[PDB]
Ligand binder design. Structure first.
Ligand SMILES: CC(C)=CCC/C(C)=C/CC/C(C)=C/CSP(=O)(O)OP(=O)(O)O
Ligand SMILES: CC(C)=CCC/C(C)=C/CC/C(C)=C\CSP(=O)(O)OP(=O)(O)O
Ligand SMILES: CC(C)=CCC/C(C)=C\CC/C(C)=C/CSP(=O)(O)OP(=O)(O)O
Ligand SMILES: CC(C)=CCC/C(C)=C\CC/C(C)=C/CSP(=O)(O)OP(=O)(O)O
Ligand SMILES: CC(C)=CCC/C(C)=C\CC/C(C)=C/CSP(=O)(O)OP(=O)(O)O
Lengths: 333, 327, 333
């Protein structure tokens, strides 16, 4: 199949982070996740493109899940860098239709719901923390849920993995919030705001005020609060990861979670989050002799990064009790 | 959820930068049992270490420490040590100790009882012979090894053969203790504690504190190298002990500190820095036995390669390393 | 224990910086078998490489080396090579060889005999065609892979299939040997050794020595790229071979050099420094930092990451562009 081979090239051109771990997935999961990724990538490139007017965008996002079924559908007017995935969509959608019906149900359900969610947020920033969760659910939680339903449909993981959508959602929210926290400056420089207004407006009048050197003490307080919010997903991350029985699936799910915990540790109480992108830490003496390939070691690596955070909690921070408390809760479970 | 247990894990993290994360990663009942064992031992260490407690007050403290586990109101408010918090709020610790299955209690109390006798015995004296060095390390670290192994077996996560093999469990403790005592010459000397065995150092200098001055550095590295050579004798037992373990969380908990000690010893070997300050510890991680073996073998080759011919222990260093490689 | 065997392990550590620890980590009977096999191979290689031994003197030694194993007093005193100690104290090595179980003796002798024949044949000729390049590699490395595999099967630590599939074991050795030859172009030049197949390099330059001249650096890299492309053909067999291993210590032993070999090709690909010094051997992204070659999915992901490092660097200008992309694409399938 030249078609399937073109899918794998698109994956390597398009997924810096998951291309290799996706290709190491056992049996039927390999193609199903490869394709899942490519359709979400296409959806994202559409949602992403500021050149497409909302009048054209809303229908594109709503009906995307059905383009999956229309052999000749493609989109020729994208201005995004990943636009080949839209221009050669018939190739991706052919292989999609070539998957076991059970995987198509999952992929198409996620595209459908993602599309609806994306359309809702086209017109609005995030206000409340509840709304932060809603946004991350649509953009990342559903990816967690989708993947997790693919693992279970393949029988490489027990049915609980797909059934427990709350744990799957938590996996996505944790990476998504960590990315949003990490990228404050790069997003600000690009006219994009993802930090929840109900939170930042308690510190400054505009989100962009975090970029100014006189507001750094406030910016960091806000940072620490959001980081603390994000840590609440850790018990679910640990629960989810500890249920996995397949090595290829475990590598795929664990590695991004570990990287995210490390990022949060590097960001906590860090002024640098606001002068640029943040330098990830050296790794503690215990983490250095472990990688993220069995559950106990993952646990230990997460616990260690929790301590790197706990060690740095300064009493004058207004979230300090809260940050101590969640970490403390996680440490005790 | 227990506010008492939350406090214990808080303490674990305050006092154990090194072991906390792997203790927390332990499967099932081992997690709480090892947490409590660690805190109880940390309380007992703190009493031992504290120089403001007169020997006559300290002896009963160490002797009777195991009984305090069963005295709900017992605590010590007089310590000035860094980890005093664990003695000052001992009731919270001993309460969580009493919530453990008896199976675990029996082991912890038994180790405390024996450790206390041992600690008290060495209060008055400095370590003389190598046999004595072993005895002291047996009491403060070998017993920990033995108690830990008995906890793994009692929990059923490890085979009964793990807890029954007390000799190799003891060697696991002796190796960490000796490495730490080798590494901390300088820290120990400027806090007025002597742990280097006298029958060894007294062949090089008149007072153990002489290794701290520049003009005795040659002799100092000589004695250092002799002590490291002694410590390496434990590595075979370490490999055998680790090879028996079948639980991955226990394996990580046991293996990582051993591999870290081996790295320390490799960094310290022939290294003058031991006497001038702290030492820089410079496709595999330590979570399966064949990888651990290879890491260990590599560190050994790093020692083998720096062996100076002139060094008094050179042949002996070569011998033990040769033995380990061929095993 | 045996003082004889201790001497063997000293020699092992003197001669194999790379493999020693990993060989020492092998389970049970395999440890001494592979240690002794390595040393015997090392002694044979030393006879082969030593240019102070005339072809006429050398051939009969290569031919009879397999039988010297049963001559307790046999030693060689006239080598001036670095590892001459293994020839000079060969009786110690052959003593321990004769202490191996007989089923391991049979294997080691058989390989030594066939390697000797091969080595004799190439002592007087250079490598012409790619076919001839596989044959030479077969003789000096492919057979090592075959020998090792048969040791694995005879020990019952691996399935009988491992030893039987001689083709897949051959590809493991070919991949290493081709990688070393590719990496070592410059050191080999300065030593009067030529291993690049002439039917390949003669289509670029009149004399293999010209790649060392600054002027032809562009034609040089192009050959460098075509040979790399040739080596990449073995990777699917490497993956297949690795995928069959069930013993951890054996897996570790087999996977790690294959990974170091792919890492080396990635680094050498399109890299001009292959003709100025030794190539700065280097790391991937944080995911290869977050994994190590000790399980099959992790090795696949590591392989795929290095696969993409090469893919993204393929210049259109290059005459092998199309075949490099096709082989990589094949590996991704
Ligand atoms: C149970 C477990 C998971 C790990 C072992 C950690 C502990 C607390 C072991 C008890 C052995 C010690 C530390 C004895 C006293 S020497 P010292 O270390 O008290 O001397 P120092 O700290 O330098 O004053
Ligand atoms: C198969 C697998 C592991 C994962 C799927 C990965 C993909 C392509 C997910 C799409 C998620 C979306 C819509 C955006 C990225 S976060 P954003 O909304 O902040 O950025 P955006 O502006 O939409 O690019
Ligand atoms: C249940 C489970 C295992 C996971 C939760 C879902 C996952 C994996 C991700 C959330 C979606 C995101 C943020 C994808 C980025 S893909 P990328 O690397 O292509 O983005 P890039 O454009 O390269 O920065
Ligand atoms: C048999 C077996 C599994 C292990 C051997 C027994 C163990 C674990 C330890 C021996 C006691 C020592 C030397 C502890 C280090 S104190 P520390 O390093 O805890 O002090 P720190 O945490 O750095 O404050
Ligand atoms: C099937 C399988 C498991 C393996 C394939 C066959 C093998 C192992 C090797 C081929 C020989 C080579 C090129 C060795 C590396 S150089 P070196 O050893 O001289 O480098 P060093 O001297 O050790 O530093």
């Amino acid at each position: 199949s030249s078609s399937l081979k073109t899918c794998y090239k698109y994956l390597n051109q398009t997924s810096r982070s998951f291309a290799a771990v996706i290709q190491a997935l056992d049996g039927e999961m390999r193609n199903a996740v490869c394709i899942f990724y490519l359709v979400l990538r296409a959806l994202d490139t559409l949602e992403d493109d500021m050149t497409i007017s909302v009048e054209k965008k809303v229908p594109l996002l709503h009906n995307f899940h059905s383009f999956l079924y229309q052999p000749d559908w493609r989109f020729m007017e994208s201005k995004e860098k990943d636009r080949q995935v839209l221009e050669d969509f018939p190739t991706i959608s052919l292989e999609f239709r070539n998957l076991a019906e059970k995987y198509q149900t999952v992929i198409a359900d996620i595209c459908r719901r993602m599309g609806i969610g994306m359309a809702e947020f086209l017109d609005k920033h995030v206000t409340s923390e509840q709304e932060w969760d809603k946004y991350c659910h649509y953009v990342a939680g559903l990816v967690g849920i989708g993947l997790s339903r693919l693992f279970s449909a393949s029988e490489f993981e027990d049915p609980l993995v797909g059934e427990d959508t709350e744990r799957a959602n938590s996996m996505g929210l944790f990476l998504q919030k960590t990315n949003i926290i990490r990228d404050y400056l790069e997003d600000q420089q690009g006219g994009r705001e993802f930090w929840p207004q109900e939170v930042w407006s308690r510190y400054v009048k505009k989100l962009g005020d975090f970029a100014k050197p006189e507001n750094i003490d406030l910016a960091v307080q806000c940072l620490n609060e959001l980081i603390t919010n994000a840590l609440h997903h850790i018990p679910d991350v640990i629960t989810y990861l500890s249920r996995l029985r397949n090595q290829s699936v475990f590598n795929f799910c664990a590695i991004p979670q570990v990287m995210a915990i490390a990022t949060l540790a590097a960001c906590y109480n860090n002024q640098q989050v606001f002068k640029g992108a943040v330098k990830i830490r050296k790794g503690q003496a215990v983490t250095l002799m472990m990688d993220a390939t069995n559950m106990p070691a993952v646990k230990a690596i997460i616990y260690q990064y929790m301590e790197e955070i706990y060690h740095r909690i300064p009493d004058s921070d207004p979230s300090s009790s809260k940050t101590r408390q969640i970490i403390s809760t996680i440490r005790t479970q």
